[PDB]
Design a protein around this ligand. Structure first.
Ligand SMILES: *[C@@H]1O[C@H](CO[C@@H]2O[C@@H](C)[C@@H](O)[C@@H](O)[C@@H]2O)[C@@H](O[C@@H]2O[C@H](CO)[C@@H](O)[C@H](O)[C@H]2NC(C)=O)[C@H](O)[C@H]1NC(C)=O
Ligand SMILES: *[C@@H]1O[C@H](CO)[C@@H](O[C@@H]2O[C@H](CO)[C@@H](O)[C@H](O)[C@H]2NC(C)=O)[C@H](O)[C@H]1NC(C)=O
Ligand SMILES: *[C@@H]1O[C@H](CO)[C@@H](O[C@@H]2O[C@H](CO)[C@@H](O)[C@H](O)[C@H]2NC(C)=O)[C@H](O)[C@H]1NC(C)=O
Ligand SMILES: *[C@@H]1O[C@H](CO)[C@@H](O[C@@H]2O[C@H](CO)[C@@H](O)[C@H](O)[C@H]2NC(C)=O)[C@H](O)[C@H]1NC(C)=O
Ligand SMILES: *[C@@H]1O[C@H](CO[C@@H]2O[C@@H](C)[C@@H](O)[C@@H](O)[C@@H]2O)[C@@H](O)[C@H](O)[C@H]1NC(C)=O
Ligand SMILES: O=c1cccccc1O
Ligand SMILES: [Zn+2]
Ligand SMILES: [Zn+2]
Length: 446
């Protein structure tokens, strides 16, 4: 969603989201930091190439050709400057001139020290309570975004971590067709398509960045959870980490973990998909988590085996037609978990990433809701670690990431929805240590 400077009547009317950086001569005098050389307000590029025939409602959904339904001009920054303002630096760069290299290391959560484990847990908790300094979220779609009286932007403040939940929600929600009509659900701007891995990579980079600024610790890094152990249990679900099971309710988190106090956002689908509203910042209800608990679905009662990871990393093409959840021999569909680890499609199979979600048999395994469970962060840095090893191993071969006829949202040059500033899948399709300022301390099975 959008910088608070752009969630106004004026900015949405002008179609321009190009905020000032240091307005020393008055408002509008330093848009995108043009006073210095940091950037310039510029026309948006959005993907205009066709998508797969599965989405038939072109013209109906604000996520199409993102961000054009809200803004057609944004800040484009020069050099290694970056941000909605061009006021910060691109990943891997710090300093006023964006010329100092940083490399942060994402490590296995179980390898952290007693203190490092405690620091991480409290930092997640701080992000859950701390208002995001920059972004606000919409509670209405574009037709109602200026509110009933036409002068009241329908945006809410939201915490650093709940923004992380909301953007995942917004990417997966159904297309609203109107009161009385059933919303359309064969659409997903962050799953079931090639954008899945790059979407989720930016997802993590933006949370990590937000927490660095919240903590004022430039080197803070999100750890990972090696869920590919074949285990029957959740080895990070302990009270010094992500929280153990409640002895008073098998589906709740131990009261001796702060995460039992969290309350989730976006759990009112029945309202959103009938009234046409969007998830707002009001929390409601605790995290439900029940590892291995899906007795009705035995396939999701055990986690992935180690070799599952070693096998999926031998799939050498990033994606294959039809670039969807039923692709075969697609690395993306394999690690996403709709193929078996060799790449062989099967409508039944759930493996790796999908399996790790469903193993939680709770909030973490529901599509509109799953970042509400903070295991999500660690589940996806590990998924991102596998992706990064693939990028290393096959020379970041983006050729099979399709430029057209992908499911809507997944064309290569699509701006990933709804991140801001606009950022394409291509911008994330790079090896992380040289291009994004982070690397993984990890070892792979042979
Ligand atoms: C760039 O956008 C302006 C502003 O319009 C907004 O932009 C989009 C997000 C879309 O949602 C528009 O409906 C928004 O109003 C465009 O100028 C407006 O054009 C409309 C007709 O299309 C007109 O009724 C308004 O008066 C115009 N507003 C202003 C301030 O002139 C502009 O045409 C767009 N330029 C492009 C796409 O190149
Ligand atoms: C993958 O699933 C898709 C969508 O369910 C199937 O693709 C086509 O879908 C269009 C409408 O989107 C229909 O005309 C057909 O059902 C599909 N085209 C065919 C069968 O030629 C597709 O069949 C699936 N791919 C597989 C199973 O390999
Ligand atoms: C924030 O979201 C909640 C959940 O959708 C909204 O509360 C619902 O509002 C509908 C109709 O207004 C009621 O029928 C439901 O019973 C409400 N749910 C709950 C849990 O109270 C709430 O109105 C939204 N806030 C804003 C400002 O839109
Ligand atoms: C957690 O697992 C239970 C089953 O172990 C799920 O409940 C089952 O849901 C299916 C499909 O909705 C029903 O056919 C079964 O009758 C249910 N069984 C029981 C014992 O409840 C539950 O939906 C799962 N929850 C999540 C979030 O995954
Ligand atoms: C959102 O909240 C605004 C508060 O602005 C600032 O936000 C963070 C950084 C906190 O430090 C807070 O204390 C600050 O004041 C309010 O002005 C307003 O209620 C909200 N604005 C909108 C558009 O919803
Ligand atoms: O976001 C998800 C939520 C629930 C289950 C499986 C896979 C997901 O990516
Ligand atoms: Zn997801
Ligand atoms: Zn996921």
């Amino acid at each position: 969603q959008f910088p608070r400077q752009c969630a106004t009547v004026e900015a949405l009317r002008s179609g321009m989201c190009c905020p000032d950086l240091s307005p020393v001569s008055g408002p509008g005098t330093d848009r995108c930091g043009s006073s210095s050389g940091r950037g310039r307000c510029e026309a948006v590029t959005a993907d205009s190439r066709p998508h797969s025939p599965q989405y038939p409602h072109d013209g109906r959904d604000d996520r199409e050709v993102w961000p054009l339904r809200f803004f057609n001009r944004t800040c484009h920054c020069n050099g290694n400057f970056s941000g909605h303002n061009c006021g910060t630096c691109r990943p891997g760069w710090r300093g006023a001139a964006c010329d100092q290299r940083v490399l942060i290391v994402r490590r296995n959560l179980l390898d952290l020290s007693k203190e490092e484990k405690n620091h991480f847990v409290r930092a997640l908790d701080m992000a859950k309570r701390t208002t995001h300094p920059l972004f606000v979220i919409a509670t209405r779609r574009s037709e109602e975004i200026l509110g009933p009286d036409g002068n009241t932007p329908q945006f809410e403040n939201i915490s650093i971590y709940n923004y992380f939940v909301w953007t995942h929600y917004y990417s997966v929600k159904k297309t609203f067709l109107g009161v009385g009509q059933e919303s359309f659900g064969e659409v997903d701007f962050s799953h079931e398509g090639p954008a899945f891995l790059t979407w989720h990579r930016y997802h993590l980079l933006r949370l990590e960045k937000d927490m660095q600024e919240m903590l004022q610790e430039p080197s803070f890094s999100l750890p990972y959870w090696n869920f590919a152990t074949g285990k029957n249990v959740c080895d990070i679900c302990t009270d010094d980490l992500m929280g153990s099971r409640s002895n008073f309710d098998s589906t709740l988190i131990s009261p001796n973990s702060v995460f039992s106090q969290w309350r989730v956002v976006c759990d009112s689908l029945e309202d959103y998909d009938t009234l046409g509203t969007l998830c707002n910042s009001t929390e409601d209800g605790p995290i439900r988590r029940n590892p291995a608990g899906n007795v009705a679905r035995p396939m999701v009662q055990r986690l992935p085996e180690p070799q599952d990871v070693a096998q999926c990393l031998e799939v050498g093409l990033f994606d294959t037609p039809p670039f969807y959840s039923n692709s075969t021999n697609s690395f993306r569909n394999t690690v996403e978990g709709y193929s078996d680890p060799t790449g062989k499609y099967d409508p039944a199979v759930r493996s790796l990433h999908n399996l790790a979600h469903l193993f939680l048999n709770g909030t973490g395994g529901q599509t509109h809701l799953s970042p509400n469970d903070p295991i999500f962060v660690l589940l996806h840095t590990f998924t991102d670690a596998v992706f990064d090893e693939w990028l290393r191993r096959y020379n970041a071969d983006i050729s099979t990431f399709p430029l057209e006829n992908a499911p809507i949202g997944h064309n290569r040059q699509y701006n990933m929805v709804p991140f801001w500033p606009p950022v394409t899948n291509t911008e994330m399709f790079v090896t992380a240590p040289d291009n994004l300022g982070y690397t993984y301390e990890i070892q792979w099975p042979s």
